[PDB]
Every structure is written in structure tokens, then in C-alpha cells.
Amino acid sequence: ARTVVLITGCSSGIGLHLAVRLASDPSQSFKVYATLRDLKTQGRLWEAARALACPPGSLETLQLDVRDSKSVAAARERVTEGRVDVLVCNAGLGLLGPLEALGEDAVASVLDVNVVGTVRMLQAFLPDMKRRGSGRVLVTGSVGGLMGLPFNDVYCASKFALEGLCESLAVLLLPFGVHLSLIECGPVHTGSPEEVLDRTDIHTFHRFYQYLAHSKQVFREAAQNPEEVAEVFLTALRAPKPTLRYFTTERFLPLLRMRLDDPSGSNYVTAMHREVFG
Amino acid sequence: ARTVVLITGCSSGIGLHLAVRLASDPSQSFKVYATLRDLKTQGRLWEAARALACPPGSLETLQLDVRDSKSVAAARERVTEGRVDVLVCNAGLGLLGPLEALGEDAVASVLDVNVVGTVRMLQAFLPDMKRRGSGRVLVTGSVGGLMGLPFNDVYCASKFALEGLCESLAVLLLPFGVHLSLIECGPVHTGSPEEVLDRTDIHTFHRFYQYLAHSKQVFREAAQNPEEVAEVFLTALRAPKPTLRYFTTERFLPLLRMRLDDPSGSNYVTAMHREVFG
Ligand SMILES: C[C@]12CC[C@H]3[C@@H](CCC4=CC(=O)CC[C@@]43C)[C@@H]1CC[C@@H]2O
Numbered sequence A, B: 001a002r003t004v005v006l007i008t009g010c011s012s013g014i015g016l017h018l019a020v021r022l023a024s025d026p027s028q029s030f031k032v033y034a035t036l037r038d039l040k041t042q043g044r045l046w047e048a049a050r051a052l053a054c055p056p057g058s059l060e061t062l063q064l065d066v067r068d069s070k071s072v073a074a075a076r077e078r079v080t081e082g083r084v085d086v087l088v089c090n091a092g093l094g095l096l097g098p099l100e101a102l103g104e105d106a107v108a109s110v111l112d113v114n115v116v117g118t119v120r121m122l123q124a125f126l127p128d129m130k131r132r133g134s135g136r137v138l139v140t141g142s143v144g145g146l147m148g149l150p151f152n153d154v155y156c157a158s159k160f161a162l163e164g165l166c167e168s169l170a171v172l173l174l175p176f177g178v179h180l181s182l183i184e185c186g187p188v189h190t191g192s193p194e195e196v197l198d199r200t201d202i203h204t205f206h207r208f209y210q211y212l213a214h215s216k217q218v219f220r221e222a223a224q225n226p227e228e229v230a231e232v233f234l235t236a237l238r239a240p241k242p243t244l245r246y247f248t249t250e251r252f253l254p255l256l257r258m259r260l261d262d263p264s265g266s267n268y269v270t271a272m273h274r275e276v277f278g
């Protein structure tokens, strides 16, 4: 039978491209449940699916809001096969700005969607995998989950949290036959100045501008095509003994090694301040 | 004048012992605001304060619930000096058990207290430090924030999140004169089987027992006295150029280095499964 895949956050970006890559696979090996918070956003997904000639029935959309455990359970019940071979936890939110300028609701939302929503997915689908002794779980990671980035304090908190969540589960899941992997992505092709200025000091504001200018230059130079990133997920899926982490690029490994080599954090803080700010 | 210190989570453990260490310092250098979620739990703190003969006025208690930004702001207004020289973000919750056995509320609470509550403290007190160009922020960390531990999935998610939060802020704060440091603690001297069994499978349940037996043995062998741990906070406070991280012990550095040296995570997962389970 087909490998049943359920992917969260398929309205755009990595989840959209992964969903159509799998559904359009020439071997027709996969049945994909592409889940979205709001079905009103499914148009780009269906435009992409048609462009790759996904066979009828290879791709289905479900509404799934990872903030709501009832929505998670209702989507699980919509899997007609009664099993999920591959779960891809990809839904996520970004949050950029001076820490004191971020709304309390926005902070709590990033954590609820990125972290608690992944926990909700894992609590809903892991038990069936553990009892069957098979299943693959892929989690969309970021280089921001491996090293702290200025003005991404809460985003990095949430991506570092997925690292701890997944590494902790991987230690237990080792002998269960259930494989969990993080796909560590760099940049991928996919408030107003006035309000930020009102909630922070002028120096922090100026540094935010510098960060934004630097970020745009790196994105322009180094963002990867979503097709190349989606193929790393497929590589992890086909591995007989998948590792805990896959990297979409080796570009940030040097910064990572410097980080990991000086546990006091001094070398990394100095190097990243220089890298972003000059 | 005195160095004004505000510490969260002083009802027991590290925060209680730190508060009385600082308030009883022979030099009388510190004025300590020991904050607690519920003032009904302040008895051990006052028993400890009297035992160390903390001078009258060296220690004051404030009610502060880090889940509530109004409580954070009301406590900030109670600092009569109108400034905080040292902020110690220590309030935290643990959560242990099979992931699928944890209540959704309990998960969301660990994240709200440990992560969003620290963000609330930083948003409330950082701006004044940045404008003055001085201030120390100490955050209670854990070895569980540096490496994933089985059956601590959500606890480790939350402690890994503080790593990302603090490292991201430290990159920005470098030139502001505001110093942020994590104090990485190992074990420190400080649901029912039936309900866990009903929410998980028998194999996971057996592994939980093994984890608990192992954890108790390590705690018995390696837990540090809270006095020794509190003194690491003082060491970070007195450093002219404090590093991002301080370690209370070097016992877990080897596991950490192995972790950091194999970015795929394979060596760490295998080593920690063997370390916990045999
Ligand atoms: C900060 C940074 C440039 C901006 C990058 C960041 C990695 C992650 C990232 C993803 C994006 O989509 C926007 C650009 C950013 C935010 C990079 C890591 C090192 C580099 O200097």
C-alpha cells in the first residue's frame, strides 16, 4: 500500500512544496494529507499540485489548527487509512523585533504554535507508531534552533525548544522502531518602523535596522530553493536508519562548531555580533 | 548605595538559598527583593533568613506570578530604589513523564512559566538597564537545556528555549553594558504510577521506571549543595566581564562535548540511551 504522510502548515513554503513533491512522486508511493490552519489559504497548494500533475487522490487537504487539540484529533480521524507512516511537523511562526517591542500575545502564540502545537501532534500520533513499532516523524528545524540570533529571541527560543523536545524523545524512541528527525533549514525562498520605534530605545532601533539590512543581504545570497530543501526531507524518509538531524546546507556549520567548542558562549557572542553588525 | 537584586521563585531551592546568601552577605552590599508566586510559601525563606542573621531591611518579599504581566509590573513598582542592578530569573517548573501522559495544561504551563515568564521579566526590566547602560541579568539554566533527557521532553524544551532566548539577547546586548548570563545547574539538593500507566503503553511505562531508578541514583551521587550552587551566581555577579554561561559542575561536560561534536546527533542519542537504560 501507499506510505501515508500527514504534513502540518502546507499553505506556503516548505510544507507546500514538500506536500506536492511527495504527492507527485513518479512512483506514486505516497498518499499526502496536507494540513492547513485555514482552508481559505489552500489555493497556492492546489495551483502547485496541478502544475506537478499530482494524480487524483494523491493529495487531500485537511483543516488543522495546531493550537487546538480538538482540531488535531479531528484531522487524525480524517485519515481514512487509519494509520500515518510519516508525520511532518512543519507548522511554525516567525517573530522578529526588539524583545521589549513584541506583544505578549505574539510571544505566547509563537510558543503555542511552534512548541506546544508540535507536542500536541506528537501526543496524538506517536502512540499508534510506538504500538506498531514503525513510523517516521520529521520536524522542520532552523539554524536559529542551533544558535541564537539577535532580534529573533522568541523565534530562537521556540526553535531551540524543538531541539530539546525532539532530542529527548529520540533517546526514548531508539529501540521502538519509531524514527524522529529534525530537518535543519537555513534561509529558504518562500511591525511598522513607527510602532517598533515607540516600543524601544533609539540605539536598539538602529541596531534592528542593521540586523534587517544584513539579513536581507544573506537571504539574497544564500536562500535555498524550496525544491532542494524538500528533497532533504525525502532523503531522511528513505534512510533505513535516519539520524536525529539532517542539514539542508553546510553554510552555518562553522558558526555552529565555534559555538559548540566554547561552552562559555563568549566566542559565539563576539563572532555573531561582528557577523551581523560589522 | 546597595546593589538592588530582584529574584524570582524564592520559595525553595536555588532561589531561596541565593536570596538569603545575598541578604546575609557580611559586607551588606545587597538589598534583595525575593519574589514568590504565593506569599503563603514564604515561611522557609524567613526561617533561612533568620538562621543567617540577615539584617533588617536586607530582604523583602514580593508576590510575583511570572504568568501575569500585571503581577510583574506591580512587583517592579514595589522596588523603592527605582532601579534593579541584578535581575535573577529563576522561577521554573519541572515536568516528568511519557510525553503522551502529560496533560495539555501542564505542558502549556511549563512553557508559560519557564519561557514566557522569563520573557515577561526581561521586557519589564531590560529597558531601564539598556538606558542606564548597566545591569546584570542571571538566568537559572539546567544541563537539560544543553542536552535532551528522556521523559523530560517538555522540561528540556523549556530549558533549551531559555538558551536560545538568552543567547539571542546576549548578541544584541554586548555593547549596551548590560550583562546576561546563564547559570547551568546539574542536580541540586532542594503523576501516580496508576495514572501514568493509563496514559501510555507498558514498554514506555517500564522505561519510565528505569529512568526514575537511574535518576535517583545519579541525584544521590551527584546532587550539589544549594550553597555551592548559589555561590556560582555570586561569582558571575562579581565578574567584570561575565560570560554568557557559567557551569556549576563539570560532570556533564563530556556528554555535552560528545553531543556538540557529532551534529547528526547519533552519538549523543546512543550514548544517552545507554547511560540511562543500560
Ligand atoms: C543572521 C544570519 C542572516 C539572516 C539569516 C540567519 C539564518 C536564518 C534566516 C532565515 C531567513 O529566512 C531569513 C534570514 C535568516 C534570519 C543567518 C544566520 C547567520 C547570518 O549572519
Ligand SMILES: C[C@]12CC[C@H]3[C@@H](CCC4=CC(=O)CC[C@@]43C)[C@@H]1CC[C@@H]2O
Pocket: B143, B144, B149, B186, B187, B188, B214, B215, B216, B218, B219, B252, B275, B276
Ligand atoms: C539523566 C541524568 C541523571 C538524572 C539527572 C540529569 C541531569 C539533571 C537532573 C536534575 C535533577 O534534579 C534530577 C536528576 C537529573 C534529571 C542527568 C544528566 C545525565 C544523567 O544520566
